Symmetry: C5
Subunit: 364 residues, 5 copies
């Protein structure tokens, strides 16, 4: 109802986009940032050109995440406004094209892990890619990437079936729940499109991650698991948990519903007389947004996914005003982005229709 200080649109306005069949003017300005300027906008062309990311100082290892989060937001744009669905589809085609460039996945080879980023392991990369293939096809109805999608889904399914633990590692011997969450969601999306049952593996996964990987009282996942030693790194992680619960809510909403109030009690600090909120990254600290610095931004996405308007408003009042948004020539820019992936994650949270709603996207 009331526009908070430094905000571009109300929480109510974000949540009402889909009912209005229109994105807010600031979301439109973000899409302009994404698409407008020749050569340097991130969605200018399908080529293996990364000038947009160079200009933002994106570290190489983060590029795959930036593209994927953009793609996730774009899928919701398509659902919100039928008149932007073709644009969204176009941008998703670009996203998938760029994602396959060696500048994006080549860390796998440079780090010594292999020359092929798909064949085994590396689930953060190939999970996102497989989700993107599916969202592109849900938005557009095009089979342009279906051959590849059929292949990658099967690699994923086969690697899950072959592993003694439920899921797939990233680097060899590094297991992350948040990266697996994306891979499993990608199976749901393939099943929606094809009528298959690759998603049947999800139960065993949800059982596995609720053992040593979770503190069920705190509603929080541990940082990682390492199959060769059986070790779990003994610190709970807010950003890990927020991202994971958000994606799991589209598969097993009960799971996320169970842990969500505990997660909030463990990590979320409300401040400024109830107007704002910020998220501690681990236990035993008062500091917010430690570690990779993304706890509050992923919690914004979680709040959106769970329909928690009050927490969404508090978090965006913490994140957005200090970053000093402006809209210049109808395009959005932030003078002081507070983290990596800033515009990407604020975009995604502003539009996000729910993973379950994306799974149910009506045909074009």
């Amino acid at each position: 109802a009331e526009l908070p200080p430094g905000r571009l649109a109300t929480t109510e306005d974000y949540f009402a986009q889909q009912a209005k069949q229109a994105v807010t003017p600031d979301v439109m300005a973000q899409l302009a940032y994404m698409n407008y300027i020749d050569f340097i906008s991130p969605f200018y062309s399908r080529g293996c050109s990364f000038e947009a990311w160079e200009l933002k100082h994106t570290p190489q290892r983060v590029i795959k995440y930036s593209i994927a989060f953009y793609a996730y937001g774009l899928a919701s744009v398509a659902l919100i406004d039928p008149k932007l669905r073709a644009l969204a589809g176009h941008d998703l085609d670009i996203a998938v094209s760029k994602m396959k460039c060696k500048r994006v996945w080549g860390d796998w080879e440079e780090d010594g892990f292999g020359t092929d980023p798909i064949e085994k392991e590396n689930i953060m990369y190939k999970g996102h890619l497989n989700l993107m293939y599916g969202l592109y096809q849900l938005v557009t109805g095009s089979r342009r990437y279906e051959a590849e999608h059929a292949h990658l889904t099967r690699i994923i399914h086969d690697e899950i079936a072959a592993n003694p633990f439920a899921g797939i590692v990233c680097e060899p011997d590094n297991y992350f729940v948040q990266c697996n969450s994306v891979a499993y969601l990608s199976l749901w999306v393939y099943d929606r499109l094809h009528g298959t049952d690759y998603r049947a593996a999800t139960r065993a996964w949800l059982d596995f991650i609720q053992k040593d990987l979770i503190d069920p009282e705190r509603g929080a996942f541990y940082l990682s698991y390492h199959p060769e030693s059986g070790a779990v790194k003994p610190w709970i992680s807010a950003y890990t948990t927020a991202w994971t619960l958000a994606m799991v809510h589209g598969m097993d909403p009960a799971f996320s519903e169970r842990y969500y109030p505990r997660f909030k009690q463990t990590f979320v600090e409300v401040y400024d007389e109830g107007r704002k909120a910020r998220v501690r990254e681990t236990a035993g600290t008062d500091d917010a947004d430690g570690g990779v610095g993304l706890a509050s931004a992923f919690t914004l996405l979680l709040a959106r996914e769970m329909g928690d308007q009050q927490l969404f408003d508090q978090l965006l009042n913490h994140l957005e005003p200090p970053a000093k948004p402006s809209i210049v020539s109808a395009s959005l820019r932030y003078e002081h982005p507070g983290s990596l992936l800033f515009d990407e994650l604020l975009f995604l949270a502003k539009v996000h229709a729910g993973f379950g709603a994306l799974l149910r996207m009506p045909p074009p």
Copy 2:
């Protein structure tokens, strides 16, 4: 028309009278000196694949092709203005073509992953400018030095237009830009003038096409781009896109540009400083001038010239030139604060531009 405005080098009346006087203004001559004078570092020092002039101005690689082409367009009008500079213009156009073919210029096509050959398909911004340049070189000089290449490229363009389900050719795969097409189509008109052929016949279907989803008739403005694989049109209108397109189209179908020009002005042009100045908004729904690539005002200067709109030309040049702080040192022009990319190139072109139709009708040497 005839009082010299603050910070200006010559009056708008003087620019518009160059052809009648058969002489360029002294500042245009000073720009030609910047272009030609100093060993090794002037842009038109030699035909080699050397780009020191552009290194010194910090031209981004992707922009070089545009810089060369806009110089070439201006040089063709110099040839028409002053017969005594026609040979110099021909010389510079020979260099422009030579440099345009260097891999430093076109090599982004390969680096981006689109192909090793920049002519064979797509890439119409590059090859459209190249083809127009081949034609202008030959109109100016009467030389057939590049005719074999011109005959080949013209036919690749024509064939690609015939094979496409939409009217025209893409740049990057799946990126269609009306402005880049406008240059390719004009190149056909120039080939026809020189050869007596009818490649220009394809222009009608193109003008029909762009007046569908690609134009907003209320605003006399083209949308940013079209993307054939999805059928998407990026839903923002673009001033610099429009200005450039209407300017080139006015040499092919003057009525088309005349139809849209008053709308285009109302949509994008802000007159300010009590009527003395004007600046151009790049898109709708903003008060800001010169957003995006930052070239709206400079391409509108070209359009104003093409349309004979002396008042708007004067207003725009009053906005653009004085803050850039021109000076002429040793009879050569420099700007202390160029306001955009392609600044000296576009202010040169607008000052000399005789009209695309007049260039098509250039008398033989």
Copy 3:
């Protein structure tokens, strides 16, 4: 005990970790620095990636020492707290993996000494590697590296047997007692694991180093020995001595016990009314921490090994407060590390359970 100014935990608390079966909170915060943040933490993955060391400006030639000192501390963490044994094992797996990357050992080739860093000489590198292979296996029970450990132990043993002096050189014609000390301890660890007697060569080594290499009155080793000429560089070195006596105390405690009081009288300056201590690197100077700048930090390790709580306290009061530790988001950082290898050596000294206790580590 009282917490001294600028300190994170008391000396009593460090010395009590093993009895409490728990690391202090600041040691845990160091382990979080080591393990927490994606890509940039030193123990993020097994890959040949060194971002953590790039961020700290570690000179190439120091990387091998950094890894090894971390590994030595990790072995003690395994002994302190059974619940961190799996984590420690995991980190040691990473340490061994990284230690084998050419970024770590490649100076050997770049300097012109050979393309293979194991086959001969180069005992600083291969001695640490061999000790690490053993510690990994004591901590984990895993044979992952046993084939390599068997091979390397035999190269070391053979090279010792073939040399006319007791031990092995680093660069050709450069003999250092500290580097040899690590190699010899590696034989003791191999013997613990396998039931062999490679450690029998230790007696002749201890006899040899007590000739021209030691000033027995000062309880101090000379800098180096150079077999081709028979020269010994005629300056005594505190860091050399402190490291060597520390490792030797796990093999022949009497040897170190004999020299330790003399070493202290030779090099250690107590100051600030008995609260602090700092160590001179050589004789004939009043300056502390000359040379490689590690005399006080290695003496901290020695004091821990010898059970000298008062000197430990004094040295840590000199070293830690000016480096301005803080714990941010439950992870330790120093604003002003006073030397190379700073966080590594303060970690190691805080947790070190004694080289003899590591040799005796009970099975998992």
Copy 4:
């Protein structure tokens, strides 16, 4: 002539009297110490393909050939001035020729895409200076060390002049410069002096050719360049081009330069500071001095010397030297603030220069 002006090292009378006294001035000697003294970093330390001296002065690569050549030309006059320095001069010329052949010097030809061989065709600025240097080396020394190469290069030059439809040879393809040709032609005169041949006969047709569209005979000034493919001449007159050209031509056809010299002065030379100083505008239609490559005043100093114009020499050197803040430290000369490229080279050359005709007539060793 004989009061020492402010900031000067020696009087004009003293420079002009060197040859009559058989002794260089102390500042010239200090320059020769700069050139020869310090291990590794002096420019004439050794024959090797090392360029530290030029690295320390920030000489651009493309300028190195010119620096070596101008040193060589000054060294030839040193040999004539003082017999007791003739052997040193010869030694330095041996080094100059050696260095001139190093790829760091001529490699721009290949990097710019014009060929792997810098001698075979075109590239007359390089190979003209090289050919003149071979000749001066041999006049100074009597040595045939480079005679086989000199006979070859002289013939390549002669053949290329005979095969061209215009009189002379280009630098980069299609770039004709009169100053670069003047050096090539003078090289033929030197070869003829040494061998008794008549390659210099081609000079008459050259002097006729450069007096057509390449000259403004009323202003006594040459245009910047000629471009044989188009026939264009770049329409700006150039002071440095003219001063250099007239200086070299005065050793071949003294009447040619005597004709144009007063006109050249009126066109370009500004006397200032109550008659004590002079500075040279690079082109017409400006008040600015030393624009362009920044060498008009320094080449005019050389011309004044060649023409025996002591007053103008004095005025120019009063403009050039004092602000550059010479000092002599440990009997070696340095400038704190050289005012242009090639500064110490051109001031050296102008201080010693005995006249190109006199170099042609150098007595045997």
Copy 5:
């Protein structure tokens, strides 16, 4: 015997080292600079590693001179203190090893003169190398390099016999008397060790350099001679003369005794009430230390060679105090070295026992 301001030891103390069989403490601190710190000290190892020189910004072309001058000093340390003889030998072994690295001699190839630095010409490089081979063997008694020494001596002898002028050039056509003086001394040393008569060539050389290459009234050599033109660069050079007279004094003491007083009159300025002296590099100037900047430092060496304590004292008072020596952790450093090769040449002059005394060094 009074210690002058800013000096580390008295002139009397330097000159008395050999009688006391001990180096002064500051010379010992220089030897610590040279030998102490891992990796970065110049005499750390025999490898082709040049960190020490990188840290002092030594130009590539100067490295060969630095190593040689260190080696010359080291030979006198051997003679001063029998207890440092083994160390000196060790360092000389390193010096020879380094001298052979392409980083040291590779300018010869980069300049276009050839791929082999000893086959012909290049007498500055190969003269120093040959002298070094001989000093190494005098100090140590070792034949480690004898095969190479026998070959190089014979290449030098053959080249002298084949030339129409007495000696050998450096770069083609560049003849320097100082570079020849080192080659000729190398033949004396070979003869001492082997009983041969390669030194018989010396007489014709001493005759030759006293023609157009010397101004006998001024006691000064010209800069260089250029056989192809017969030119002599017409400026006399103090550093050239000082270095040449110093080495010749070990072969024909009368030659240097003849010219020495003239050399001083020509180039040496006594100042500061007789306390200091500084050397002009050429005639017709008042400025000191022009050109390569080494006139005063090579005159320091000459004064030492000639036994001229007063001039030695005066020069060292000019050179050392402004360079602001300090000894930190028993190792010497200069804050403001006044020239290239500064620590090397002050080291050499402080220890130098006389070239004739080095030729007469007793066996180990």
